[PDB]
Amino acid sequence: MKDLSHYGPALCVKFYNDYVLAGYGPFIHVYDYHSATLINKCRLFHYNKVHGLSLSSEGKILAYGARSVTIVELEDVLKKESLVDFERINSDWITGATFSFDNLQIYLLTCYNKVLICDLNCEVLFRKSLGGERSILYSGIIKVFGPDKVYVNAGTVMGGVIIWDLFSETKIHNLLGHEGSIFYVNLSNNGRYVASCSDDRSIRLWDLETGKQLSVGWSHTARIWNLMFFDNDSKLISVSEDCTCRVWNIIESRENVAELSISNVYEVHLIKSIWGVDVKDDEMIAVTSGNDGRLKLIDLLQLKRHGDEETSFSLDDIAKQCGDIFEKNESIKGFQWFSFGVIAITSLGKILKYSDVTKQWKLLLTNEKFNSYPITNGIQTQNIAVFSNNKSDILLIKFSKDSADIIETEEFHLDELSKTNNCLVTEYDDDSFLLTLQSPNPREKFVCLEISLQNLKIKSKHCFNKPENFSSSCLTSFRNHILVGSRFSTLVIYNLLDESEEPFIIRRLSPGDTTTSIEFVEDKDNSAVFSVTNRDGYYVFIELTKNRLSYKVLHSNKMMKGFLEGAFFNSKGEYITYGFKSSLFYLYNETNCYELASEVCGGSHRLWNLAKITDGHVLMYIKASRFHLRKIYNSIVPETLENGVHGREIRDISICPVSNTNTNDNFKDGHIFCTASEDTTIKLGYFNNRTGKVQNFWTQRKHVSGLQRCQFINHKLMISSSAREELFLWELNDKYNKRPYMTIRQALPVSDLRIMDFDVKFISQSGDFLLVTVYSDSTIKIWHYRENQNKFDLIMQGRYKTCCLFNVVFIALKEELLVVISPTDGHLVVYNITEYVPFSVDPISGDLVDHKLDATISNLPAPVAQLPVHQSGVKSLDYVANATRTSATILTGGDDNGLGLSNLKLDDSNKVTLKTSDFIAAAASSTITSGMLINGGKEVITTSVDQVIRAWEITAGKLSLVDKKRTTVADTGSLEIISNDSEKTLLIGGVGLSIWKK
Amino acid sequence: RDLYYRKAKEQGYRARSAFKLLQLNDQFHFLDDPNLKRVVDLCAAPGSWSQVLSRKLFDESPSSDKEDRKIVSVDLQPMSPIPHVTTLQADITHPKTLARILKLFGNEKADFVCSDGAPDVTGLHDLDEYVQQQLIMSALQLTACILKKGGTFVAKIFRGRDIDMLYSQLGYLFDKIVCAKPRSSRGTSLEAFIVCLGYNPPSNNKLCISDKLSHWNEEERNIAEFMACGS
Structure with a gap:
């Protein structure tokens, strides 16, 4: 066979000059990580997995796992399918391995805290060990500071971290304080610090000169498997059974030597553990390897890289630029993103403009009709704002691309509607868009307007009868029909050519209530496929066929957690979803099961909006009396090098x-x-x-x-x-x-x-x-x-x-x-x-x-x-x-x-x-x-x-x-x-x- | 959270694992012998196998075969006391815990030594299996001595990729090596039990049994015979 x-399970990962080397089962995978291309797969071990690997400056690869160890050439790993004949078996489990300072020997740490100094054929030259009782290790590393300054850092089952000097066989520290077994130990490059982690769920920072504990960190919610220093020893990155990768700041002060402070949490692997991690200090990128076989690239500067990722304004900040113009209890009640920035409207009908270029706000005009619970909609692609209220009034404004000048304006009142409680908009074709307006009176009509994209005038008005249990929640158009998402998982399809035709009603698509998005996917022959999401987490793909219409449910599923507010396909054909889990906005790749971005919004998250921009999205929301702009940029590197499978x-x-x-x-x-x-x-x-x-x-x-x-x-x-x-x-x-x-x-x-x-x-x-x-x-x-x-x-x-x-x-x-x-x-x-x-x-x-x-x-x-x-x-x-x-x-x-x-x-x-x-x-x-x-x-x-x-x-x-x-x-x-x-x-x-x- | 976890609370057993040694003894019947007199339970915490030992050899045994019967259960973790069990908080490695165990007997060797010890699995199978064969090895240290020649030794194993090494490494020292799941043993577990019957002949920060079993064996694998245990 x-x-x-x-x-x-992929147990370790290393950055090496534009490559990522991953221990991946018994293989090494070499990737070009900027393009996520797998250059080669080379089997190193007959059956053992690769638990660790490191590279010498001159391209030799030292790899170990369980009792297996090998020294192999990066050149060969790049072009050979297998190198298992170079595998050697040591009598004891190998906990760690590193090259000597000059790369002419290797140092092997066994699980019994003995170091085997070997030649580059992996044959033993001599052994170093301590005196006293044996120690059983669950972790350790050998840290080479100079040619004769080698520290052996042993993580024992009993919860001590033993730091000893290799060549003198002399105990330097016995760091005590952890409560369980030690599952990883690492040292900062500058010789200042030890970091250890246990299944007590803590990370502990130790002073390597004094041997004192400086800081205990508790963030991870399960056992911690790996950690290391990065960014010139100012930060720590840890990786856990809780499937998160966590970044910590090392904060140095006079009165306390240094302390760990949690900085960022990334959920990046499937249930359950994450085993490998490494950071490319250059680009502030991390790579993680998981039990799920996934290799994840993480932007450590997702919120800082381009310098405009996070912005917020209170109404006082805004008033400092527009002037003291706001009345008591007046706040922002709607907003849209356009090429130039934000158009917003207040509870008193003040229309404001925020410029992305100049960072300035200005009052644009006031329309007192829309001091009555204004609702905001838009056609972002064409810089068109849509304002409605509860009195059947509409205001449309079009803005110039860079200038943001008002170049078209139209206003009207719909006599067919007494009180209005919902306004939806959708694109229609190259020259017009659709706008629907609804009322709560059961015998009033559901009104759909076709409006010009050039001058915002009404091209045609259609009035439909509403079915019995119907409250419109989203809108899409397709050919000459409109698909209207409704409550109770209902979807109503109307014919714009014949407002007397009986609508096609799809009832109860899912157990949920509000339909949040209807998105066209593909068509073939006489069938079109639509993605239909539901606020309560369910999504369905329906097939609409022209025979008269009929429909079939092709796909159904539920999100793992939280509200599902929409879904779309990206250019690579992957199903992207967005919504909320209690306080937290998410953008999630549902095809490959990983989060693209997250943001803490205002718990209720009453007012929020998402728009597509070149190279990403802008998330707008109100939190704690502030207007927030969060820019979500496309990843600087690919999201994964391998997507992975199940982690169980x-x-x-x-x-x-x-x-x-x-x-x-x-x-x-x-x-x-x-x-x-x-x-x-x-x-x-x-x-x-x-x-x-x-x-x-x-x-x-x-x-x-x-x-x-x-x-x-x-x-x-x-x-x-x-x-x-x-x-x-x-x-x-x-x-x-x-x-x-x-x-x-x-x-x-x-x-x-x-x-x-x-x-x-x-x-x-x-x-x-x-x-x-x-x-x-x-x-x-x-x-x-x-x-x-x-x-x-x-x-x-x-x-x-x-x-x-x-x-x-x-x-x-x-x-x-x-x-x-x-x-x-x-x-x-x-x-x-x-x-x-x-x-x-x-x-x-x-x-x-x-x-x-x-x-x-x-x-x-x-x-x-x-x-x-x-x-x-x-x-x-x-x-x-x-x-x-x-x-x-x-x-x-x-x-x-x-x-x-x-x-x-x-x-x-x-x-x-x-x-x-x-x-x-x-x-x-x-x-x-x-x-x-x-x-x-x-x-x-x-x-x-x-x-x-x-x-x-x-x-x-x-x-x-x-x-x-x-x-x-x-x-x-x-x-x-x-x-x-x-x-x-x-x-x-x-x-x-x-x-x-x- | 299964059948046996409520049936343990119903009969006052400290853990569901109590039934693994019972369902074991429904076969082999190494605890149904009236001649049976001295037993050691290693890595006994929280003590459900020691309870089973107490119930079987005292509460349910005629007063005529309760003489000189002595149960000593060892763990590095402190244990709540059990009627008719002497609980030692000591390391199975350490010096006088072999002499100590021997003093609490009339320097008679134990008729039967059992161990249900296992660390919490990490999810890394090669590590979990190696750590388990660590604990069996160091447990074999004291069983090598204190156990009476021709006497049973029972241990929990990780029945995985390298189990056939452990069997052959154990071929030198037993008449019939058996491997047993009971039925309280979760299907979700790689768990099994190595019931070594007929202690045969042992030999005649330093060298330990792991390295001298690794010395002789080495890189060879045998398949122990299999035995289902319960009724």
Whole structure:
């Protein structure tokens, strides 16, 4: 077998002159970080991960991890695929490694606080150690200050930080004060300070000359894994299990030597830990490496780099420039951003202008009509401000690009409306925009105006009847229709050409209330796709088709946290979202799951606005009697060098099977697939068939607890399960050009206890299917899924005994429908449910036929076969039926690290006999977690917790081991296999994901 | 937060882990022997395995086989006292904790030494597995001596990538090496138990067992036989 790609724990990262070098599993990745290009992947270690690496000035790379160490040439790492022959194994765990001052030796710190001085072939020259009791280390570094001044800085399990001088073997300090084990120690470059961190969640600053504690810092909310000094030892950067990277100021004073002060918090990795960090002092950029396999670049000056990122004005600041013109209790009630800056309006109808160039405010004019609760809207692209009030009055103003002069103005009053409570605007075409105005009287009309972009005159006015439960909340236009977001997840579509036509009403798109944005995405043939967001976090993609209209929900999901106020696609096709979590504004890349920017607004956040500008966004908001301008600039460097996958166990993987359908051509070079994690999410993405490169699309968040199973049951349906009886049927759509879509189609009825496994059998051509689920309490249920009524009907229920049931499978042989379960007692148990369900089995490849009878709940018959196979629970279950479907061979992998092969046969009288054919008692060193039959049952691939992938051959019902290969994927627990057209692609899951070819 | 955590509160056991040694003893029955008389529980905090030892060998044992029975449980963390258990706050490395344990016996060797110790996992599997085989090794220091030849030694293991080293490193010293999950052992855990039966022959800031087992073994792996334990 050949290893192709890996995404998984990346333990360290180093900046080196426009490269980032990342320990990435057992590999080194070299990136050109300004362009985020992967220059090469070089495997350094056979199976160990790279825990640390450093570079000599002359391009030698020293790398270590666990007991592995190597010295390797940067030149080779840039062009060779593997350098594992240079790997050496030391007898003890290696805690740290650094080059000697002149780079002619290396110094290895073991976990027992001994230093091995070695030559550049990694052979030991001599050993240094202290006297006294042994110390067990969870961290340490060797800090080289000069040729003979080498400090060994040891972080013990017992919570002391031992600082000793290497060559004299002399204890310098025993820094005590931490409460738990020491998980990282580092020294400032100028020799002043030690910083240590523990699982007591504190960071402690120590004086290296005196040995005194100067400062304790508490910000991180979980265990801290790594830290270092940067920016000429004036700052500290730490990185944590809490998935945040935190920057601290070192503040030096006369009366206290120095103190840590928290400065910035960045949430940059997926749950959970962050392991590596490094800072490029030049550009004030950081790189972090995570358990999720993500490599993140962080702008440490996101708020300072260009000097205009943060600005605020109180009404007194403004009055100092406009003059003392504001009345008692008058405040800013609306604002828009244009090319020149801000246009704002006060509660008394004063219209103000803030100039981005001159930084000056000035009163522009007063319109006393809009001292009655003014609302502000705009067409930012064309410098048009829209003012409305509660008395059906509108004021439109157009401004010149640089000058900001008023070049057009129009005003009108809508007699059709008595009181007005909502005004929306949207772009329409090259020469006009739309404006809608609504009232709370139910029999007044919903008014849509088409207005000229050149002179702001009304081109046409349309009056629609409002449906019953309708309050407009957002607006988009499309061709000749308007899509109006409403409350209660309602979306109303009107026809601008015929205000008497009945609107197309889409009700209840999501559990939420206010529709916050409708955004056109793409069209193909007679269908257009729209993104629809909901304030409460849900977003849906709907498909509108011209046949008369009809619609389909293509995608649904919920944001992890907080209010969702809008979403759009950027130039790279990534779904960007914005909203609030309590006080905090967020801008979030929902395709790849990381935050782009955040800002503390005014808790209520009553008044805020976002606008696009060249090279970013401007966020405007009122907080604590101040008007705030926050400029959010596009990252100076790419956001990531790798996007990453799950940062927790991958319990299952499923590839969307190849089809005769209309799958889009851009997916031709690869496959769509799902990973299901203990982090409770399902991630839908794609891998390239030749390169194994993985791209993310969506992270589906419906499940409340950790995933157990997910399987594509055909080309467009997928079932996942978790616990607490979560079983969801999903529908996939892969017809469009850039991404697939997925939406929930139905959830399984629920009776706590978990759904341990399931299997499905399709009812001929129906698209209906039968479903078996088995539960933690030994219960078994069989369901009929009816497509047209989109419901699950319970048609059989029973129980095995009392123990958990871990796997279940439908086997159709001849005209019998069999259910095979694998309880934790290690048996194979067979049920023949044919006579007790209203379905018939077609004699070859086993198709169900619906008799169309009414639903009775049958009881589960007694088993027809009970075969003990394994000594404990059976973790993997698979089967293959022969050409005549008279027999099937059943492969089981056990928690007893045994591998069993059984035969399920029916004779001419249809009696079931289950016979075991072979059993390999020591098939693996630990739990076998996967076992799949391939090539018509002739071969087997297994997965196990010992991280050895084994390939087997079956001849005459007997198993023989034919190949084996280690993976870095720890706790290897999931496996998926697809044929190319024979050669196979294997997806290997655990903590990490690997793609291999066979 | 599972089944066993309420069933522990219901029977007054300090932790759910109490059932792992019970479900273990539903097999092997190394605690159902009436001849059984001296036991050591290492890294015992908070003490649920020591409770099980107390309940099995005193509360539920005829007065005729309670003679000279002595349970000593050790941890570097201080433990709340347990009826019929002598709790030592001492390091399994340190000098007279081998002599100390031996004094509290009639310098008789222990019939059975158990350990359920484990550090909090970090999420870094290679580190977690190495740290665990550290604690088993240093635990093996004292079990090498105090345990009666032909006597059981039980320890919790990280059943991961390098477990087959530990088995072979332990081949030199036991008749039958077994590996066991019980059923109170979370599926979410790489946890298992190495139940070494029949103590066979031991040998005859310095060198420690880890380095002299690493001395002889070395870079070789064997598979211990497997045994499910509960009913």
